[PDB]
Design a protein around this ligand. Structure first.
Ligand SMILES: CCCCCCCCCCCCCCCCCC(=O)OC[C@H](COP(=O)([O-])OCC[N+](C)(C)C)OC(=O)CCCCCCCCCCCCCCCCC
Ligand SMILES: CCCCCCCCCCCCCCCCCC(=O)OC[C@H](COP(=O)([O-])OCC[N+](C)(C)C)OC(=O)CCCCCCCCCCCCCCCCC
Ligand SMILES: CCCCCCCCCCCCCCCCCC(=O)OC[C@H](COP(=O)([O-])OCC[N+](C)(C)C)OC(=O)CCCCCCCCCCCCCCCCC
Ligand SMILES: CCCCCCCCCCCCCCCCCC(=O)OC[C@H](COP(=O)(O)OCCN)OC(=O)CCCCCCCCCCCCCCCCC
Ligand SMILES: CCCCCCCCCCCCCCCCCC(=O)OC[C@H](COP(=O)(O)OCCN)OC(=O)CCCCCCCCCCCCCCCCC
Ligand code: SF4
Lengths: 67, 104, 115, 83, 171, 257, 155, 96, 98, 318
């Protein structure tokens, strides 16, 4: 009967969740538990390149505790 | 213009963005506002042939705010020297020009 | 740079997948399977003659509209102007003269496949 | 009428596309002219401070907003809220 | 990295060189879809992502017609394009050697600064905006509807009249 | 002021229109060879196209000639009966039913009634074996594939009304000049009833799918508008003339069985 | 070991060719009607990985149904000489095997085998759609038992 | 529901843009003193430790105007490494 | 910027050098006329994009609405060159000098 | 750690596409009352590997009359693009966010044509020149509408970034504001992605294996790998632009999980079509889409311009 289609779907259905859920966990691992922090404008790039300059060269960290 | 039916009507059909320092979209600036302004408020009511010899300081500058040429030979003569100076030495680049510094 | 890391790949994923298609089938190319098809016969003409299309006029009306489409695309930013009454009107004026230009051709038998 | 109003009836039965197009065309320009809220589009779009508001310097004049943002004078848009 | 745009620029000059040798209109059209793509890179290499994509939207639907008519008007029994003779392949290889010649000539005359292969890649943006917002292109192109609404009527009228100007040429 | 480089320049015309009658078109001779699925295995159909519109076609039917007007000459009237299944390989019994009458006429013989009835029964099951094969094959070429499959479960259900009657599913040499070779078995009409009560719905399950669309109704309509008096000049006589309004049929006019 | 690896590769190379073999939209006679009834919902080709593609370049087997006339014969070997050459052949019918009827006529070739070489022969005047299906299951093991990498190792 | 929601996205933008208004002073102050620290820190290289050449001024402008020229990437860190040169050139354009 | 415009000016010229030397096609000269436009799009955009002259950024589209409307009138004449000859060779139209 | 994201972005779409070849043969089957593949694997789960591994062993036809350079570049250019369109496609956070992330789609969507033109032009054959020409008047037909049906939706959104629509759809699907757009979008997702009830280009019954007939197995798969890979985009967009799943940012795998549930329907909705409707004869499709959709498009294009300014609904440029 028609239930023989579900393997073709639910194996296709464990195949388009990966590029969505892998795209975040791979970002958080690289970005320090945060999101990728996209930059559309020239201001959000300045905050990065500022925050890149308030730490080690990776920019997903230091804030208050300093002065 | 020939058959100037813009001043006759007053309206600015298209004579309000002929140059750089001309009503940018929201409030931006066109990278040489300070110089074109100083060039064209100079060359008003003196028009033409006498905007070409006495108002030459303002164009010689605006010709270098825009082309920005003499800053290249003044920044290529540096490299030509340092690239010559080093390679036979006599120059140790500091930390803040070879990488490692304390950013701010 | 991050995109060049995505897209030089896909050329290689295609280019590595094609070299393993010409150099791993064991071919036997001689004369009569290389020659063109036409459904079991030797083709009469040379396959590279004037086609003489019939939608020639519509291809141009597209050629004019791809500009006009391009000439619409800044509307998502134009609404973020302070006027929003010339953007109102001049967006009606562009879309209207188009339909007028489209309705004239629609009646004068432009998009009708000359035959 | 009949000789115009009943012509729309076949043009709504057959050709039921141009009637929508010719309607929505004529129904697009007409609605902003009879709206209560069209005034705000040039105002909600004029409130956005994309660029920085340059302050003037006090010279014994302009009893406007003093040197304090939360001061009741000035363009205090309470219309955007409570729209 | 520093040699980015000089590459995209010389691959454009070449995309417009073979375009000039006039092969069949297909391999000229191919020669423009490339150089149109390459134009989307340097326009984008200096900022605005809109304007580059535009060329790479017009001259796709542009050259899609150029593929159509050439199959109906402009095509031989044999295209005879690039790898077909030696009159084109000489002045396609001696154009490129002329390129590597010429640009390497006048870096020796580094006085007019037409190319500075040693001072290359360090003069491309010129002090843009670093702290800023609402600056990209497409804000400028959208001045068609505020403060430049004569670029708009004058180009719209061209397409209003092109649609009439074109059929009287066919009729 | 003529020069040697200009004595060949004849003067121009007055109306500024000259004469260039060329006829240099050649119209791209194409063929639907005998592999195109449109051609039912065998047809060539050489063209003269002007792009895609058809100016002149020239079918070269003959790629399946075998010569079964010359082999009947060397085989008796029973030994030639199954050739007639091959002519229309979709409507088999309707050919046997024809050849099994031209023979009977020459013999001045009539078959029994029960043969005439069953000879009519299968003559109008073949009517259903074929318009399935025409409604659906005319839809493969146009794109709709499913009613082909829906009915070839319904069509094989009728080959079992030959195999349960004759032996062969398709080429059943069953309708001979001597009436019919062999009677029905006890469990046959009781199954056509269980087949015929339901087939009328399967048309509705297809006739729905096609007789109300746009595509089917914008793809077949105004195609082949062959007029009335030209069909007869061409000699169609089957369905390509009653489809144009000529009331004509050889079962209301010339009922044979 | 090398032979055992090659026997399994050559058993694994054929699983693809024998499962997903794409026959060709042939025709020509009554016999082709049974192929449709083998595309029908009773004896499904597609269940066996068998698909009609109507071009030889996309094909993997020819099914010759029907009288192969002398006019059609060039168009039959012009077509067999357009596939790649893992190409297989199947001769449905007694008009295609020997020309059963029309063996003695003048416009009929006395066998598909006169012209194209053949891997298998399906008899029957209209062979039952469950009799090509026995053949294209038998052609589906006739090249399960081909050894094309084995006889490369020992060579 | 797109009336009442799209209004709020504006109301959030004003909230989000006025935040940016409060921090222009801190950034513009840092950016001034930063770029005003780059090109003194390029001058001292260019003053004694380099440039013992013939007639050559070290703080030498190329204008007659005396006003402030906003420096640029070709001058400002025009002689740092390439990666620091390829980070405003091609920094935001190449996707964060 | 002063390495591309010599390289784009030199790309304009080759296309100007191309649409003056023909090779037996009117439809490869019209074709060479669009890459001519294209180098002016880019050598206008950049000038309007390093100078940050956004007020001039409406211009690189207005240039280009007349790159296809000119090609449109250009393509449509080939329809009327073909329908006389059917070959589209530039050497075939010389009956005006008379 | 980026290559490990592409590796988990291209493997899980070439392995999905493969099982759309299967699912496009079973769902069509059970409608035809005929089981699809059941045998090579448990329920046909292992048929595309045969089909795939079958095609990379047969002789890639290098026909005698062709252009062997463009011959080889079109399938390189088809499988490249339609695979490369998944790059910005935002399951919540994309591999590559882009401001103009949808013009990237439109432009690269158009270069999927030149894989169909350069192929059939290179391959000397009448039945492939047509299929090339059959795309020319097809792209001419819908491409006017894949912009305006895509603009007027993104007109009551702001930037062209596909990421913004997740916030535009934070409380509602855009299917309800614009079902007229979504109708014509669906058909314009169906002309692009030439797989269709109106195929007209790979016409087995008219133009047998058009743009594709001189191509044998090796290059041949790169179109099926590209065509059935492109079927899932133009449904994946409808699951972003019109059907807005759940963001709720602490479980972002709820978006991707509902993104599944709708994309398979819209990928399984195309499958009812091919098994339900014939083609448009190639003169109707351009009389169906300049006459019926193009005016109706410009109207709603005009309505959504006077939709926010009438009310207030101005999208912000974040
Ligand atoms: C992933 C791709 C792997 C493909 C091969 C997997 C095995 C396929 C299969 O199940 O059938 C193999 C076949 C069995 O299937 P079969 O195709 O021979 O017959 C199936 C039986 N009927 C038709 C009745 C339903 O087993 C073999 O003998 C092949 C041996 C080589 C495979 C590699 C072994 C190492
Ligand atoms: C699923 C998507 C991925 C697609 C790629 C699939 C990967 C799996 C493919 C594994 C199969 C590899 C072997 C296939 C080669 C088949 C061609 C062949 O039969 O060659 C026989 C030939 C035999 O040569 P021969 O000695 O018999 O003579 C050749 C010419 N004749 C026969 C006419 C005289 O050579 C081989 O043995 C092939 C070995 C190829 C191994 C290269 C690795
Ligand atoms: C500076 C470096 C930039 C390159 C300088 C020019 C030299 C490069 C080679 C160009 C000439 C090759 C040629 O003759 O082309 C015709 C050839 C003709 O080949 P053909 O298709 O007619 O077949 C020939 C068959 N054999 C091999 C048997 C002789 O086809 C092409 O190469 C066209 C592709 C052009 C590639 C450029 C486009 C980039 C890819 C698009 C995406
Ligand atoms: C040398 C430069 C002059 C141009 C080179 C080509 C020669 C020419 O004049 O073009 C003639 C050609 C006419 O077309 P046709 O009738 O088909 O010619 C048949 C001739 N038997 O028409 C053409 O071929 C079109 C010409 C376009 C050329 C564009 C590319 C020019 C690039 C090469 C420049 C010259 C190289 C300089 C090298 C300097 C040495 C250091
Ligand atoms: C077989 C033939 C194949 C050849 C054809 C291949 C076609 C590939 C597909 C075409 C690409 C479509 C056009 C892409 C334009 C860039 C899209 C864009 O606008 O965004 C670019 C993005 C910056 O833009 P944005 O994000 O909006 O700015 C704000 C910062 N976030 O970020 C960027 O700045 C990156 C921009 C550059 C990316 C261009 C990709 C080029 C890939 C190389 C192509 C050549 C192949 C290599 C040579 C191999 C030999 C064949
Ligand atoms: S063998 Fe029988 S069924 Fe087959 S083609 Fe010949 S007559 Fe027809």
């Amino acid at each position: 009967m028609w239930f023989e289609i579900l393997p073709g779907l639910a194996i296709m259905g464990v195949c388009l969740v990966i590029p969505g859920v892998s795209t975040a966990y791979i970002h958080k691992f690289t970005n320090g538990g945060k999101e990728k922090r996209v930059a559309r404008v020239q201001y959000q790039w300045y905050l990065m390149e500022r925050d890149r300059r308030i730490s080690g060269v990776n920019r997903y960290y230091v804030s208050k505790g300093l002065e | 213009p020939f058959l100037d039916i813009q001043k006759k009507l007053g309206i600015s059909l298209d004579r309000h963005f002929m140059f750089l320092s001309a009503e940018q979209p929201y409030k931006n600036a066109a990278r040489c506002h300070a110089f074109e302004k100083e060039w064209i408020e100079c060359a008003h009511g003196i028009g033409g042939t006498r905007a070409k010899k006495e108002c030459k300081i303002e164009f010689d500058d605006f010709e270098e705010c825009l082309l920005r040429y003499k800053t290249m030979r003044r920044m290529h003569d540096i490299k030509k020297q340092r690239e010559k100076l080093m390679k036979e030495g006599k120059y140790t680049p500091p930390p803040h020009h070879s990488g490692r510094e304390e950013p701010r | 740079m991050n995109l060049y890391t995505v897209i030089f790949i896909n050329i290689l994923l295609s280019l590595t997948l094609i070299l393993v298609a010409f150099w791993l089938p064991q071919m036997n190319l001689y004369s009569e399977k290389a020659n063109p098809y036409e459904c079991g016969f030797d083709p009469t003409s040379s396959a590279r003659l004037p086609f003489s299309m019939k939608f020639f006029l519509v291809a141009i009306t597209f050629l004019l509209f791809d500009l006009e489409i391009a000439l619409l695309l800044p509307l998502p930013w134009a609404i973020q102007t302070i006027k929003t009454s010339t953007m109102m009107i001049m967006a009606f004026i562009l879309v209207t003269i188009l339909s007028l230009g489209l309705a004239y051709e629609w009646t004068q038998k432009g998009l009708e496949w000359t035959e | 009428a009949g000789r115009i109003s009943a012509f729309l009836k076949n043009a709504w039965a057959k050709e039921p596309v141009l009637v929508v197009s010719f309607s929505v065309w004529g129904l697009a320009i007409i609605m902003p002219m009879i709206s209560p809220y069209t005034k705000y589009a040039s105002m909600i779009n004029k409130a956005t401070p994309y660029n920085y508001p340059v302050p003037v310097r006090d010279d014994g004049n302009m009893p406007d907003v003093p040197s304090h943002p939360q001061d009741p004078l000035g363009p205090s848009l309470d219309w955007l809220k409570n729209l | 990295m520093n040699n980015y745009i000089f590459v995209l620029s010389s691959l454009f000059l070449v995309g417009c060189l073979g375009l000039a040798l006039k092969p069949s209109p297909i391999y000229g059209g191919l020669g423009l879809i490339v150089s149109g793509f390459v134009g989307c890179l340097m326009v984008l290499g200096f900022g605005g992502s809109f304007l580059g994509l535009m060329v790479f939207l017009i001259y796709l639907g542009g050259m899609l017609v150029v593929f159509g008519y050439t199959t109906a008007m402009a095509t031989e029994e044999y295209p005879e394009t690039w790898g077909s003779n030696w009159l084109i392949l000489g002045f396609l290889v001696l154009g490129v050697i002329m390129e590597v010649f010429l640009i390497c000539v006048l870096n020796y005359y580094d006085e007019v600064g037409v190319i500075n292969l040693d001072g290359l890649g360090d003069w491309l943006m010129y002090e843009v905006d670093d702290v800023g917002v609402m600056l990209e292109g497409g804000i400028g192109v959208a001045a068609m509807y505020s403060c430049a609404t004569w670029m708009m009527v004058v180009a719209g009228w061209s397409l209003f009249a092109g649609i009439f100007i074109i059929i009287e040429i066919t009729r | 002021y003529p020069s040697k480089e200009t004595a060949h320049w004849k003067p121009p015309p007055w109306n500024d229109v000259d004469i260039l009658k060329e006829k240099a078109v050649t119209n791209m001779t194409l063929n639907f060879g005998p592999q195109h699925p449109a051609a039912h295995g065998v047809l060539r159909l050489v063209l003269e196209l002007s792009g895609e519109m058809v100016r002149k076609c020239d079918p070269h039917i003959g790629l399946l000639h075998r010569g079964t007007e010359k082999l009947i000459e060397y085989k008796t009237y029973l030994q030639a009966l199954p050739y007639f299944d091959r002519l229309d390989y979709v409507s088999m019994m309707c050919n046997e039913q024809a050849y099994s009458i031209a023979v009977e006429k020459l013999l001045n013989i009539q078959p029994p009634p029960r043969a005439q009835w069953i000879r009519v029964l299968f003559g109008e099951i073949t009517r259903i074996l074929n318009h399935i094969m025409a409604v659906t094959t005319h839809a493969l070429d146009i794109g709709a594939m499913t009613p082909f499959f829906w009915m070839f479960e319904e069509r094989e259900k009728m080959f079992e009304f030959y195999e349960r009657v004759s032996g062969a599913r398709m080429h059943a040499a069953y309708i001979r000049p001597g009436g019919v070779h062999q009677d029905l078995p006890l469990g046959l009409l009781d199954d056509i009833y269980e087949f015929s009560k339901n087939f009328s719905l399967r048309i509705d399950e297809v006739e729905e799918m096609l007789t109300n669309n746009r595509i089917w109704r914008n793809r077949t309509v105004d195609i082949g508008v062959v007029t009335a008096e030209d069909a007869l000049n061409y000699g169609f006589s089957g369905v390509m003339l009653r489809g144009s309004g000529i009331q004509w049929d050889l079962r209301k006019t010339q009922p044979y069985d | 070991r090398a032979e055992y690896v090659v026997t399994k590769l050559d058993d694994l190379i054929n699983w693809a060719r024998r499962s997903s073999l794409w026959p060709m939209t042939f025709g020509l006679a009554c016999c082709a009607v049974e192929m449709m009834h083998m595309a029908a919902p009773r004896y499904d080709m597609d269940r066996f990985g068998v698909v009609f593609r109507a071009s030889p370049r996309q094909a993997d087997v020819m099914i010759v149904a029907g009288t192969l006339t002398n006019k059609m014969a060039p168009a039959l070997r012009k077509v067999y000489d357009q596939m790649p050459e893992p190409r297989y052949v199947v001769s449905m019918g007694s008009c295609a095997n020997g020309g059963g009827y029309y063996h003695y006529s003048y416009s009929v070739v006395r066998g598909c085998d006169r012209i194209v070489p053949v891997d298998i022969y399906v008899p029957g005047c209209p062979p039952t759609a469950e009799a090509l299906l026995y053949g294209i299951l038998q052609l589906q093991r006739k090249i399960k038992r081909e050894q094309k990498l084995k006889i490369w190792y020992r060579r | 529901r797109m009336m009442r929601w799209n209004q709020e996205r504006r109301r959030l933008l004003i909230e989000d843009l006025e935040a940016r208004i409060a921090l222009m002073p801190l950034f513009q102050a840092e950016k001034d003193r930063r770029t005003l620290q780059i090109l003194r820190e390029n001058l001292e290289e260019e003053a004694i430790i380099m440039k013992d050449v013939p007639n050559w001024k070290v703080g030498e402008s190329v204008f007659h105007t005396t006003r402030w020229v906003p420096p640029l990437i070709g001058e400002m860190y025009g002689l740092r490494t390439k990666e620091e040169m390829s980070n405003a050139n091609f920094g935001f354009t190449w996707y964060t | 910027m002063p390495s591309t415009f010599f390289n784009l000016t030199m790309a304009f010229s080759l296309s100007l050098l191309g649409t003056l030397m023909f090779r037996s096609h009117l439809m490869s000269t019209l074709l060479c006329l669009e890459g001519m436009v294209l180098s002016l799009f880019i050598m206008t955009s950049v000038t309007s994009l390093n100078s940050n002259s956004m007020s001039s950024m409406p211009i690189p589209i207005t240039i280009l609405v007349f790159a296809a409307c000119e090609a449109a009138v250009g393509l449509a004449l080939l329809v009327k060159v073909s329908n006389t000859y059917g070959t589209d060779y530039v050497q075939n139209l010389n009956l005006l000098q008379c | 750690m980026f290559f490990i994201n592409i590796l988990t972005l291209l493997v899980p779409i070439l392995i999905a596409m493969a099982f759309l070849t299967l699912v496009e043969r079973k769902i069509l089957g059970y409608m035809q009352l005929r089981k699809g593949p059941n045998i090579v694997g448990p329920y046909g789960i292992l048929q595309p590997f045969a089909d795939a591994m079958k095609l990379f062993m047969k002789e890639p036809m290098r026909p005698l009359t062709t252009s062997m350079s463009l011959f080889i570049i079109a399938p390189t250019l088809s499988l490249t693009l339609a695979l490369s369109l998944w790059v910005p496609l935002p399951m919540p956070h994309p591999l590559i966010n882009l401001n103009l992330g949808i013009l990237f789609i439109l432009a690269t969507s158009s270069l999927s044509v030149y894989s169909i033109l350069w192929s059939g032009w290179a391959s000397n054959s009448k039945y492939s020149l047509f299929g090339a020409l059959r795309a020319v008047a097809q792209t001419i037909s819908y491409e006017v509408t894949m912009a305006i049906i895509l603009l007027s939706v993104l007109l009551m959104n702001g930037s062209y970034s596909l990421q913004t629509l997740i916030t535009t759809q934070e409380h509602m699907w855009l299917l309800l504001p614009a079902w007229p757009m979504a109708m014509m979008w669906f058909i314009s997702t169906l002309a692009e992605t030439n797989r269709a009830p109106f195929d007209l280009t790979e016409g087995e019954s008219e133009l047998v294996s058009g743009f594709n007939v001189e191509y044998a197995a090796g290059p041949f798969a790169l179109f099926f790998m590209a065509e059935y890979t492109n079927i899932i985009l133009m449904n994946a967009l409808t699951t972003i632009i019109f059907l807005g799943p759940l963001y709720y940012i602490n479980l972002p795998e709820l978006y991707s999980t509902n993104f599944m549930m709708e994309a398979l329907l819209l990928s399984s909705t195309f499958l009812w079509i091919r098994a339900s409707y014939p083609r448009f004869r190639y003169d109707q499709l351009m009389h169906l889409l300049w006459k019926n959709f193009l005016p109706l498009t410009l109207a709603l294009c005009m309505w959504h311009i006077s939709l926010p300014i009438f009310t207030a609904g101005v999208p912000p440029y974040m």
